[PDB]
Amino acid sequence: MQVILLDKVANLGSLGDQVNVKAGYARNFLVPQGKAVPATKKNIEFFEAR
Amino acid sequence: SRVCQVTGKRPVTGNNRSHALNATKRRFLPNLHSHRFWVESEKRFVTLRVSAKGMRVIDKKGIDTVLAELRARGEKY
RNA sequence: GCUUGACUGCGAGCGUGACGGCGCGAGCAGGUGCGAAAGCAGGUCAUAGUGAUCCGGUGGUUCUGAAUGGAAGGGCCAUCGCUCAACGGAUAAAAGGUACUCCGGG
RNA sequence: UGAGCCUUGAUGUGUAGGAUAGGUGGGAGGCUUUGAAGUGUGGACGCCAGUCUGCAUGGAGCCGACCUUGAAAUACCACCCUUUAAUGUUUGAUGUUCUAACGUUGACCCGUAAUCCGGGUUGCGGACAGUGUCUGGUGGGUAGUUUGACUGGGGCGGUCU
RNA sequence: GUUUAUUAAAAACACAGCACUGUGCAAACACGAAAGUGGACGUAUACGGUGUGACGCCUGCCCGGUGUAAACGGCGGCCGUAACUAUAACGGUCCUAAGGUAG
RNA sequence: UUUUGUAUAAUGGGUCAGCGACUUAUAUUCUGUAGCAAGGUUAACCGAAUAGGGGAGCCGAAGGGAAACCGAGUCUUAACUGGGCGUUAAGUUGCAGGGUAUAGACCCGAAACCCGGUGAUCUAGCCAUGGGCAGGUUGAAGGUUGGGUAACACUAACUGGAGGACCGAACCGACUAAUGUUGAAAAAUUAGCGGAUGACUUGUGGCUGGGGGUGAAAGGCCAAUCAAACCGGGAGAUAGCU
RNA sequence: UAAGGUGAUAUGAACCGUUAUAACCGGCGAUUUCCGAAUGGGGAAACCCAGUGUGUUUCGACACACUAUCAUUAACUGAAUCCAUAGGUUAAUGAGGCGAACCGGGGGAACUGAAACAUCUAAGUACCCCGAGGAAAAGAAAUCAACCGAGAUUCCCCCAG
């Protein structure tokens, strides 16, 4: 789902992209381990600003 | 207890209806699972008995605003 | 030999049964058939040939239509599916064998 | 590896034929010596008529109604149908790798002069195991189905309208 | 030895022995909506379930349906064979897997 | 009292005194009485509180048809000579009484079902800690010597003291006979009987709780009870029975 | 307020007071043993067994204020593990228990009727559990109605069996 990456993880990321990934990746790689942010429809526009 | 700590879901009593409509009491058990979380703020592995629907809610919101209302209603972790 | 009166809407009044039922039924109106005509025909010489209620199938009736016009559903008419044979037909729902038998009594 | 798909390009004989031209639509100027029609096969399709393209005979025409075809443009521009090819997207099967999910009734350390519990580190399995929702089948091990009425001391056996 | 204390003490129940089935440990199985516990601080010479009932002669044949029958089970015909009958350890058949051994 | 039939030997009452059974609440129907009369009546409420106000609402004077609809006519049918149902004939509000239905509904009296608690001081089993078993008799393994063998095997004394061994006291149990059967005792006594060094028995404390527990298994026991304990409640369950 | 009184079975004894300190009746304050939420540890209820600061012209043993549990906050300390949590102690606040009915919520049967019986029914009733108060709950429409309109919630009588 709509999580945006931050790191040099393998080829679905380019230092930040909106993707449609499976649930394990989001929760058990990206929720609480780091490298991402949840899509609260505010954080995505905030990091679009950043 | 089998209580979803995030959404508040708990088992309720239902009935397994037959073809002859014989009533038998049964409780619907929510898909509850224990999963460990790693908070960068407090430097600790916290585990929570949540549902998969609670997992989807905490994927939508985030761990911090969920803990902000877990500290509210007397929950322990 | 000719024909559909084995037609619809009826029908006073009656017998017989606790009732439903069954049976005859003069005669009205329309439309028919036979006969030259008078007249007769609303099934089978009569007494048995039967399955009611519920559900479902088919068509119609513009009868109703949870805001309006529809529509759905319901109601009315005609009809069909049951050895419901235990047949005036108890519930959606049991049949059996003990020769695998046992107890009590005469 | 099987199925769909995004982009790139070919793909279609009533029959003769510069050429196996699909359908409805615009259209009278475009290219080649930054090397062209017209002829040939290999893998390839086949009604062996030939075409596609790698290669190649060749070195100056193709073209627009064209002098041919029942239906005219491989002069150009568009959404497309069938066939078929390429990597890749998407979804399944097979087996392998992981270490993060998860389990650990393996060992160690701390809270802790604690066989509870919690945390860390390490190892072992491992997307199984186990669990929630729905559902197919199995299951007289259990239950509800209640399993009808008339019969003279009597052994047979029937009857119901 | 034990049992129906208060109408039945035994031919009933149990019994070591013998045998079968299942269980590889976080065991089978059981009490538990779960935690946990028993099994067991035991490890296939151990444990659970079942059948028989000391001991001797002994347990013969069959795995087709659910190689293994001391499981759920079966052990029927035709002729041949132990001095004048019958029975047939044994050896063929009917392809149904095969037919009562000893006593 | 029940019966076709009771003095019947079919059921009940020893006697007396006291208590004790067709009611209450709500709808509906009928009769009598009472006001008003094509009208009758108020519910909640206000209230100087059984007064008065308050007519929201109910019944009836119009019915037919399933209904739209039509209307003193309506339904049926194309329409009836027609047929069914009605029409100009008074109801309503009170009170009392006789019924109906709902509730325990004239009164007393089941095997059963479920819920919440209490019991392992009795008994069944287990765990932890202690105690008891008079006396006599028989004599296993092992140790030594002798006979026998190349040496064991086998044999004869002595030592040794093992037995789910024997006889038999306390103790445990009740197989026979007798008494007791309004008992001495809601299971005992008297005389015989079996075990009595074990699978023995006992004291104390704990554990196992009812659709369960326990059970060397009788469907035995769980407080003199058990083919599902007691206490309280649903419950005044239900009865076509007496 | 007072000439009577010291409650009753219950006399008797010993007394007090009579014109203002007898008794009677009321408000306030204190004492308020022990068990019992029971609260220092235990506990077979009215019992047993301890520690810290304060006091002994008799400084032995003891009395006084304390020392139970949970939730939150603050402070001080404080692990693997740097940072920081968890953990420990103290201070303050609140609660623990009882109580006839009423309220909200979570579980929640069968007897009986249906003349059998399983749908239904009894019934969200009996019973259990948690919490709160003098009331609780609910309460200002994503409510009705039908083209007119009503205008939070609550209770009663009709509509309406």
Swiss-Prot record, chain A:
Function recorded in the entry: One of the primary rRNA binding proteins, it binds very close to the 3' end of the 23S rRNA.
Sequence similarity: Belongs to the bacterial ribosomal protein bL9 family.
Complex formation: Part of the 50S ribosomal subunit. In stalled/collided disomes (pairs of ribosomes where the leading ribosome is stalled and a second ribosome has collided with it) bL9 in the collided ribosome contacts bS6 and uL2, while it contacts only helices of the 16S rRNA in the stalled ribosome; the inter-ribosome bridge thus formed is different from that formed between normally translating ribosomes.
Stated name of the protein: Large ribosomal subunit protein bL9
Species whose genome carries this gene: Escherichia coli (strain K12)
Shown part of the complete sequence: 1 to 50 of 149
UniProtKB/Swiss-Prot annotation, chain B:
Pfam family, one: Ribosomal_L28
InterPro entries linked: Ribosomal_bL28, Ribosomal_bL28/bL31-like_sf, Ribosomal_bL28_bact-type, Ribosomal_bL28_sf
GO BP, one annotated term: ribosomal large subunit assembly
Stretch forming the signal peptide: none
GO molecular function: rRNA binding; structural constituent of ribosome
Bridged cysteine pairs (disulfide): none
Keyword Ribosomal protein in record: yes
One cellular component term from this protein's GO annotations in UniProt: cytosolic large ribosomal subunit
TM stretches of this protein: none
Keywords on record: Ribonucleoprotein, Ribosomal protein, RNA-binding, rRNA-binding
Assembly behavior: Part of the 50S ribosomal subunit.
Family, similarity comment: Belongs to the bacterial ribosomal protein bL28 family.
Protein name: Large ribosomal subunit protein bL28
Source taxonomy: Bacteria, Pseudomonadati, Pseudomonadota, Gammaproteobacteria, Enterobacterales
Gene behind the chain: rpmB
